[PDB]
Amino acid sequence: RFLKVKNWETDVVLTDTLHLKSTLETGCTEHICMGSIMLPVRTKDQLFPLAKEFLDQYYSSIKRFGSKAHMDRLEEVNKEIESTSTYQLKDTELIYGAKHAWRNASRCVGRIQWSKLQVFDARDCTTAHGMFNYICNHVKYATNKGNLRSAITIFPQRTDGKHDFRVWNSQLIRYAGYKQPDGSTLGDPANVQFTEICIQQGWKAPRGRFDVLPLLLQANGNDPELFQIPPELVLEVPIRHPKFDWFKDLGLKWYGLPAVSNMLLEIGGLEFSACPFSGWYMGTEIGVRDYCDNSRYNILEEVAKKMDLDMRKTSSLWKDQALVEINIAVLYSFQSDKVTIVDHHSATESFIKHMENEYRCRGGCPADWVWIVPPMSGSITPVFHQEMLNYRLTPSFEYQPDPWNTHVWK
Amino acid sequence: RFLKVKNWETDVVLTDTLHLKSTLETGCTEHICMGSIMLPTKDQLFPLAKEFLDQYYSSIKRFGSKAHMDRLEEVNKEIESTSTYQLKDTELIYGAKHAWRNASRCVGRIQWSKLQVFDARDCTTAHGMFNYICNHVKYATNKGNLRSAITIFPQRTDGKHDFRVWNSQLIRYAGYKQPDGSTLGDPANVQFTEICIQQGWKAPRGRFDVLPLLLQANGNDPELFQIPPELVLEVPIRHPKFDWFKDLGLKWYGLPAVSNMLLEIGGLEFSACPFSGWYMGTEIGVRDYCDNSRYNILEEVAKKMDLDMRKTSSLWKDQALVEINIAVLYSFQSDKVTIVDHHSATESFIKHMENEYRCRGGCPADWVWIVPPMSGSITPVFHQEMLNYRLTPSFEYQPDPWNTHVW
Ligand code: HEM
Ligand code: HEM
Ligand SMILES: N=C(NCCC[C@@H](NC(=O)[C@H](N)Cc1ccccc1)C(N)=O)NN(O)O
Ligand SMILES: N=C(NCCC[C@@H](NC(=O)[C@H](N)Cc1ccccc1)C(N)=O)NN(O)O
Ligand SMILES: C[C@H](O)[C@H](O)[C@H]1CNc2nc(N)[nH]c(=O)c2N1
Ligand SMILES: C[C@H](O)[C@H](O)[C@H]1CNc2nc(N)[nH]c(=O)c2N1
Ligand SMILES: OC[C@@H](O)[C@@H](O)[C@H](O)[C@H](O)CO
Ligand SMILES: [Zn+2]
């Protein structure tokens, strides 16, 4: 069944056949759509078919489907699974897998960049200190003095479910959040629970507004250990405005490297529970969401005041006006400091080109419109006008519960 | 079977059971989500009629009453005999109000119970329709203090005697493709504008020319009518700070009145049911003025504001977008014409959803359409999970008549 997808601004119509290979569920039924819902030990039984699908996908990508190399590998894996209950991916398969997980991530607008991912194989890691070392090397490589390079570090896969490797942080670099007795919050409210766990584990918090959190690392299912990322490795950007000299006095700054560290990478049935990856930021992630969400730094009012905007009525659009200036400030500061960043106009335009390319070369591109459309100026970006089909392909990045909710303390 | 909907900004969680009463398909499947897609017999009739009547008597606390039973049998016999039936005025009004209540793409539903319903089922000709429409426009405009209303023309019979308003909205501006290759006026109505031209209309060939009504009664060919200028309220757009703004020569009409949809109540289809409420600012300021396929005025505005348009990263489109929307709102308020900003409208909708969840067990809502076209995350609905499903009575899309009419 071929599915048509139309762009209501250019009338360009695309055809999707890729969805035919979708196996996983979406959350929607023929009677209800859960399109805006945030969150809608494998058995030997279920492991081999998953492995075979992956290996077939892999051998077809390298144009060796049906070869002797292909048939031997399938037999070798089948035997390995029966023999040990799991199997080990070859390096080439791991790289291909990690890249495809990114190519298949429907909530990511930065996928035009997928084939350029540097994969660091950390499957030989055994302890938390080992993890810390791999993580530092990843941050130094990815940061590259501001000329950001996409990367992913893959730690040992899940075995029995009791020896998991986990990065307890949500991103390798994030600011601490502290709830005050008066009910106010100091720092980033989004990380309050994690910050408490860190203090409980021994972290001596400086209790400021932009304290970089320590890494809390779990190796082989053992209790997590704290480590401080070397300051010289953490690139930060002071935020100032090109026309408003008082902006710098707001005392805002942000880290240059976004590094998701809480997702699960699934490849050929195998599960990598610690797979920190990094790219670069789209400005609105910082300027709209991190600074302006009511539940985050929530600076719209303070900025609105300094701009002396009419804040007596919402119809003056004082929030919208201030929102734009803060976003101008974020982009301006990063570019001035020569730290990679992409604005939402550029990122979305590139995503449409990526999508058209994918439809022609791959038969499709799963995309979640709810997440792809930027949180500000939605309709003045081309993605707003683009119909998109969302479905799940593997390899993939999946959510997993926060580790503190499932860990058995020793 | 019981679904939960969470608001990630307030952590408030609501349970939805209303969806279990849904009957129509969404377009999605367990394998693919089509949530961002724009356009996803007597034996058929009675079950539909029964479902409706049952909901109706339940709403008036007479479920299982003799009146209920009696009515069900009357309609039943009427269908058997006539192959259709007629709604009591009370049912017509209830249905229209609920069609609005169930419109998942409408952010203005907190107002659903205040809908003035005009029964035009006795209409027979295009002149008759024109009269009803003029009365609707005057009533709803109310000198600027807009009042929601819908006018319901005769229901479908054999599909060969259908009433249709060919316009997309009762009031819209013409669009013409010029020699230059460019488009003059509103590009979205270029085609219809041509059907009016070809039909006989004399276009002033301007940038904001109110189009003529093209009315179809009982399947006959449509006829043209000029809406009395005095009945079309318009707002000249100026900025509370940029005196040059007025020189852009922009204006819009105060009354948004969707006229091409189909109203379905108890299996009965009303193909001509124009309705009107009032505008949410962004509909004009963001979509009509700034879509690249619409008036597309961003550059011009940015230029007059004299900002660097060399690089997208200076966010000049965004800066200008905001000013343009400040201008629309300021103007309507200045002229005392009802209008609502996206912040207030979205705040209302969250209140409405809460009312609906506790009083009805839920609220179908299409997130893709509910979240405003600008400043998405600073409005509350962005952070609100929403379940979309189809409940009836409802407003449905239908083909443009010029693609089905046999002249
Ligand atoms: C090259 C720069 C990249 C840009 C500009 C980009 C941009 C984005 C943005 C804007 C989002 C939404 C984030 C949010 O709203 O919280 C996102 C999500 C995502 N991206 Fe990318 N991304 C890039 C690289 C990557 C890389 C390196 C990977 C994996 C190898 C990746 C995987 C994902 C995933 C799985 C999501 C969903 C995260 C979630 O659900 O919280 N992205 N990306
Ligand atoms: C009282 C003020 C009202 C406000 C502020 C409001 C606002 C809106 C807005 C912003 C949209 C999106 C329009 C678009 O993007 O094209 C919408 C759609 C819609 N509204 Fe409302 N609305 C109001 C009254 C009404 C009334 C009285 C009805 C019907 C009785 C109604 C039926 C619907 C329907 C069916 C749609 C979807 C239209 C489509 O699919 O093109 N609305 N409304
Ligand atoms: N630019 C990015 N952006 C991805 C950032 C993803 C960002 N996501 C979030 O913070 C999501 N809110 C996590 C979430 C999802 C669903 C339900 C609850 C919570 C994070 N991990 O920091 N990445 N790279 O690699 O460049
Ligand atoms: N404020 C409103 N807004 C409703 C405006 C609805 C508006 N809708 C539209 O213009 C839709 N984009 C038409 C469409 C739908 C799907 C595919 C293609 C085209 C119209 N009819 O003018 N209504 N009242 O009554 O207050
Ligand atoms: C409820 C709704 O799904 C939720 O607020 C989504 C909307 N779109 C988003 N889009 C992106 N990129 N990131 C988010 O966190 C969200 N949050
Ligand atoms: C492709 C996508 O569905 C389309 O552009 C939708 C997005 N959201 C919208 N939302 C509203 N209110 N109105 C629209 O016309 C649209 N267009
Ligand atoms: O403070 C803990 C939170 O940061 C954590 O629960 C995140 O919300 C989660 O990891 C998603 O990023
Ligand atoms: Zn769906």
Within this chain, do residues A306 and A296 fall inside the same structural domain, yes or no?
Answer: yes
The span from the CA of A353 to the CA of A287, in Å, is 25
Resolution number, Å: 2.0
Residues of A in contact with B319 (CB under 8 A): 324, 328
Q: Are B59 and B31 in contact (CB under 8 A)?
A: no
Within this chain, do residues A71 and A137 fall inside the same structural domain, yes or no?
Answer: no
Q: Are B375 and B139 in contact (CB under 8 A)?
A: no
Q: Which residues of A are annotated as a binding site for L-arginine?
A: 171, 280-281, 285
Shortest CA gap A162–chain B (Å): 31
DSSP string, B84-139: S----HHHHHHHHHHHHHT-TT-TTGGGTT--EEEE-TT--SHHHHHHHHHHHHHH
Within this chain, do residues B68 and B84 fall inside the same structural domain, yes or no?
Answer: yes
Shortest CA gap A14–chain B (Å): 13
User: Cα–Cα distances in Å, from B192 out to A382, B226, B251?
Assistant: 26, 15, 21
Within this chain, do residues A229 and A241 fall inside the same structural domain, yes or no?
Answer: no
CATH number, residue A323: 3.90.1230.10
Choice from A38, A171, A260, A281 to test ligand 5 binding pocket (greatest atom count within 8 A of CB)? A38
- Report residue A344 as tokens: 């939402």
The span from the CA of A393 to the CA of A389, in Å, is 12
How, if at all, do strands B149-152 and B116-119 pair? parallel
In 10 A of CB B42, how many CB atoms? 11
Query: Is there a binding annotation on residue B252?
Result: no
The span from the CA of B298 to the CA of B292, in Å, is 9
Residue A190 in contact with partner chain B when CB distance is under 8 A: no
Residues of B in contact with A37 (CB under 8 A): 5, 385, 387
Q: Which of A310, A331, A346 is the last residue of a domain?
A: A346
Within this chain, do residues B241 and B339 fall inside the same structural domain, yes or no?
Answer: yes
Within this chain, do residues B113 and B190 fall inside the same structural domain, yes or no?
Answer: no
- Report residue B88 as tokens: 């009591």
- Report residue A129 as tokens: 């200190």
Closest to B133 (Cα-Cα) out of B221, B219, B211: B211
CB-CB: which of B321, B368, B375 is closest to A369?
B368
Choice from B258, B261, B332, B396 to test ligand 4 binding pocket (greatest atom count within 8 A of CB)? B258
- Which residue in A has a C-alpha nearest to residue B323's C-alpha? A321
Q: Packing angle between helix B42-59 and helix B89-101, nearest 10 degrees?
A: 90
- Report residue A277 as tokens: 């990856």
Q: Do B33 and A28 touch (CB under 8 A)?
A: yes
Residue B10 falls within a domain, yes or no? Answer: no
User: Cα–Cα distances in Å, from A79 out to A87, A88, A220?
Assistant: 9, 12, 25
The span from the CA of B346 to the CA of B324, in Å, is 20
- Report residue B384 as tokens: 């609100």
Residue A127 in contact with partner chain B when CB distance is under 8 A: no
Strand-pair partners of B340: B280
Within this chain, do residues B199 and B216 fall inside the same structural domain, yes or no?
Answer: yes
Cα B12 to its chain centre, rounded Å, is 29
Within this chain, do residues B95 and B213 fall inside the same structural domain, yes or no?
Answer: no
Q: Are A215 and A227 in contact (CB under 8 A)?
A: yes
End-to-end CA distance of chain B: 50
Residue B326 in contact with partner chain A when CB distance is under 8 A: yes
Choice from A371, A372, A377 to test ligand 5 binding pocket (greatest atom count within 8 A of CB)? A371
Within this chain, do residues B22 and B153 fall inside the same structural domain, yes or no?
Answer: yes
What protein residues have CB closer than 5 angstroms to ion ligand 8? A 28, 33, 35; B 28, 33, 35
- Which residue in A has a C-alpha nearest to residue B372's C-alpha? A378
In 10 A of CB A250, how many CB atoms? 19
Q: Do A320 and B378 touch (CB under 8 A)?
A: yes
- Tokens 């494998």, located at residue: A42
Residue A387 falls within a domain, yes or no? Answer: no
CATH number, residue B187: 3.90.440.10
Residue A8 falls within a domain, yes or no? Answer: no
Catalytic residues of B, by residue number, are 106, 109, 278, 283
Q: Do A33 and B315 touch (CB under 8 A)?
A: no
Q: Which of B310, B327, B344 is the last residue of a domain?
A: B344
B111 lines ligand 4 (CB under 6 A): no
B354-387 in b/e burial notation, b at 16+ Cβ within 10 A? eebbeeebbbbbbbbbbbbbbbbbbbbbbbbbbb
**Catalytic one of A102, A108, A275, A358:** A108
Residue A363 falls within a domain, yes or no? Answer: yes
Q: Do A22 and B36 touch (CB under 8 A)?
A: no
Residue A36 falls within a domain, yes or no? Answer: yes
A321-357 in b/e burial notation, b at 16+ Cβ within 10 A? bbbbbbbbbbbbbbbeeebbbbbbbbbbbbbbebbee
Within this chain, do residues A103 and A173 fall inside the same structural domain, yes or no?
Answer: no
Number of domains observed in the structure of chain B = 3
User: Cα–Cα distances in Å, from B108 out to B59, B280, B309, B384?
Assistant: 22, 9, 36, 16
CATH number, residue B366: 3.90.340.10
The span from the CA of B74 to the CA of B86, in Å, is 10
Q: Angle at Cα B95 formed by Cα B38 and Cα B276, nearest 5°?
A: 60
Within this chain, do residues B76 and B179 fall inside the same structural domain, yes or no?
Answer: no
Within this chain, do residues A254 and A119 fall inside the same structural domain, yes or no?
Answer: no
| Those residues with Cβ within 8 angstroms of residue A89's Cβ, 6 or more apart along the chain or in another chain | A97, A267, A268, A270
User: Cα–Cα distances in Å, from A385 out to A269, A348, B382?
Assistant: 36, 11, 18
Q: Angle at Cα A102 formed by Cα A96 and Cα A108, nearest 5°?
A: 165
DSSP letter (8 states) at residue A192: H
Q: Are A328 and A242 in contact (CB under 8 A)?
A: yes
Residue A361 falls within a domain, yes or no? Answer: yes
CB-CB: which of A30, A328, A370 is closest to B29?
A30
Q: What residue numbers bound the domain in which A206 lies?
A: 124-149+164-235+399-403
Residue B11 falls within a domain, yes or no? Answer: no
Residue A131 falls within a domain, yes or no? Answer: yes
